Amino acid sequence: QVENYDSWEDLVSSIDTIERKDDGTLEIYLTWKNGAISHHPSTITNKKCPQKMLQFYESHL
Amino acid sequence: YDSWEDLVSSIDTIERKDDGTLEIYLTWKNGAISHHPSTITNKKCPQKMLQFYESHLTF
C-alpha cells in the first residue's frame, strides 16, 4: 500500500550541503519552500524526497 | 514506477557522455549486465542510485 511515502518532494526547495558524522552517517542540510532551514539523516531524506537528492548528486559529479 | 528496485543487484559505474548526459552501467540479480540513461534509472530504481552516490562520496 505505502509508496506514497515520498511526501517531501513538493515541500523542499533545495538540498544545500552534506556532512559526515562520527558514526559514519550523513547529515543533510536543506531549505524548505517556506524559507525555513533544518538538517536530517540521509536515511530519512532518501525516502521522503529521493528525486531532490538525486538532482543534488548529479550537479556534483 | 520503480519496478526495477527489486530486480537490480547493484549500480557499478557512471560515464558523463559528450552531449552531457549520464550513462549508467549496472548488474541484474539474474547475473546479466547492461547500461541505460540516468533518466531511466533515476525513476526505475532511485534507492539503488542513491546507494551508489553515497559510496562514491569523497567530499
Side-chain angles (χ1 to χ4, degrees), chain B residues 4-47:
Chain B
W4 283 11
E5 292 276 28
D6 295 322
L7 309 174
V8 175
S9 179
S10 64
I11 301 292
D12 312 313
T13 202
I14 297 185
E15 305 200 312
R16 175 127 261 170
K17 289 188 158 302
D18 297 306
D19 70 325
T21 59
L22 294 170
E23 197 58 24
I24 317 293
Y25 294 68
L26 57 78
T27 301
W28 300 87
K29 283 182 179 175
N30 76 351
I33 56 168
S34 63
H35 61 258
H36 311 267
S38 68
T39 54
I40 297 298
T41 56
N42 279 349
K43 86 163 303 179
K44 292 281 189 177
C45 50
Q47 297 306 320

Side-chain angles (χ1 to χ4, degrees), chain A residues 3 18-20 26 42-43 45-47 50-51 53-54 57-59 61, chain B residues 1-2 14 16 22 38-39 42-43 46-47 49-51 53-54 57 59:
Chain A
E3 55 166 288
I18 303 185
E19 291 176 51
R20 173 152 276 152
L26 297 172
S42 62
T43 44
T45 63
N46 288 343
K47 293 303 189 309
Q51 297 307 316
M53 292 302 293
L54 289 167
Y57 285 128
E58 298 196 338
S59 79
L61 215 73
Chain B
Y1 192 70
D2 46 67
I14 297 185
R16 175 127 261 170
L22 294 170
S38 68
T39 54
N42 279 349
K43 86 163 303 179
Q47 297 306 320
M49 288 305 290
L50 290 168
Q51 290 301 299
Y53 286 131
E54 289 193 345
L57 198 62
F59 293 75

Side-chain angles (χ1 to χ4, degrees), chain A residues 2-13 30 32-33 44-52, chain B residues 47:
Chain A
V2 278
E3 55 166 288
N4 184 64
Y5 193 61
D6 66 326
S7 68
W8 286 10
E9 300 279 20
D10 297 320
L11 311 179
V12 174
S13 175
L30 48 74
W32 302 86
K33 287 192 182 178
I44 294 299
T45 63
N46 288 343
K47 293 303 189 309
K48 303 301 295 179
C49 51
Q51 297 307 316
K52 282 295 187 169
Chain B
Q47 297 306 320

